[PDB]
Design an enzyme around this catalytic site. Sequence first.
Site, PDB file in Angstrom:
ATOM      1  CG  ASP A  35      -1.574   1.120   1.488  1.00  0.00           C
ATOM      2  OD1 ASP A  35      -1.618   2.282   0.482  1.00  0.00           O
ATOM      3  OD2 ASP A  35      -1.966   1.248   2.272  1.00  0.00           O
ATOM      4  CB  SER A 199      -2.414  14.584 -13.378  1.00  0.00           C
ATOM      5  OG  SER A 199      -3.013  14.211 -14.660  1.00  0.00           O
TER       6      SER A 199
HETATM    7  N1  FBF Z   1      -3.666   4.460   0.657  1.00  0.00           N
HETATM    8  C1  FBF Z   1      -4.371   4.777   2.320  1.00  0.00           C
HETATM    9  N2  FBF Z   1      -4.367   3.190   3.028  1.00  0.00           N
HETATM   10  C2  FBF Z   1      -5.386   5.150   2.199  1.00  0.00           C
HETATM   11  C3  FBF Z   1      -6.169   5.992   3.122  1.00  0.00           C
HETATM   12  C4  FBF Z   1      -7.063   6.480   3.388  1.00  0.00           C
HETATM   13  C5  FBF Z   1      -6.778   7.925   2.284  1.00  0.00           C
HETATM   14  C6  FBF Z   1      -7.100   9.186   1.878  1.00  0.00           C
HETATM   15  F1  FBF Z   1      -7.903   9.263   3.326  1.00  0.00           F
HETATM   16  F2  FBF Z   1      -6.383  10.221   2.767  1.00  0.00           F
HETATM   17  F3  FBF Z   1      -7.747   9.526   1.285  1.00  0.00           F
HETATM   18  C7  FBF Z   1      -5.723   7.359   1.260  1.00  0.00           C
HETATM   19  C8  FBF Z   1      -5.591   6.781   1.066  1.00  0.00           C
END
Ligand code: FBF
Length: 330
Positions: A35, A199
């Site tokens: 992740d 982007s």
């Molecule tokens: N890939 C993740 N663990 C993840 C979780 C939440 C968000 C947010 F809530 F900030 F958008 C962004 C990425």
Amino acid sequence: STGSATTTPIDSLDDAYITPVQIGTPAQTLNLDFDTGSSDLWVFSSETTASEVDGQTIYTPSKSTTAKLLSGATWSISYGDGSSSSGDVYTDTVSVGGLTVTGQAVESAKKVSSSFTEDSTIDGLLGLAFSTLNTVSPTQQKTFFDNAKASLDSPVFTADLGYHAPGTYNFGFIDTTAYTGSITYTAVSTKQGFWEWTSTGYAVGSGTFKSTSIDGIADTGTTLLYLPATVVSAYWAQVSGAKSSSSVGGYVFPCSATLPSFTFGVGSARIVIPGDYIDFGPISTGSSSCFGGIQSSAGIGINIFGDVALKAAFVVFNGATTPTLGFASK
Ligand SMILES: N=C(N)c1ccc(C(F)(F)F)cc1
């Protein structure tokens, strides 16, 4: 040093990808979700509340001769979908595709929410965002990449996700046979802890390219492509019968449709997402309404270049002193 590991979709929709990871001595192999939007390496474990384990492979620190409790440390994390997990922390030996880190913080779950329990294919997470997002208290811990970096031939990792097919995560080198053309690099902001970039615009299908800056994160841990409402409306307006459904939770479209491609800009370069990558199938089993792979980021607070976008590219996460992101077609 280098490492190379295959990543495999968990289901027929590419809802997520799992990569085998060796933990401990003798090795315990768990299939983790890599992740790039979070920074904790956490696992289902022999400490996880029994009723919250349903088919996952667990890490048992007491069976590892190299495991050590990291005394006093705890962790707790929430993800985009409302899911969460928490527990305590061990250090142990972790290897990914032949690349070994000693003393890695392995966050052992005591508690996981229902969405984790309900997914038997994911044994935990391996975070690849910046270590400033790591949730361990009171001593924040480093990611696997952060710990590995000084041993790597080059301070990089690459994501080459497949469409309905396996792909690869490489550490420490760029496989010049895995992409076509050249890699275009773009600036990264680490201020929110993410691989955040801008982007240069988009096109829908065979339409003209719209030059517009779209700030967002490169996130292997998010399934879909979340973009501003204007962009998403422009995409779905090209699909007869598509509509945003508040009851389903986003854009849906007739399963009889042929979807247009979506292009995003990386500097002067362009990455084309084929229309089939944007089909997430029936909203419920047997339905003729299908869920879209491009959704609005309004209310999230950030745009997210998730798997739908990343799997159309070969992506370089360059962890040099000034980090950057590279994208190539493939
Ligand atoms: N890939 C993740 N663990 C993840 C979780 C939440 C968000 C947010 F809530 F900030 F958008 C962004 C990425």
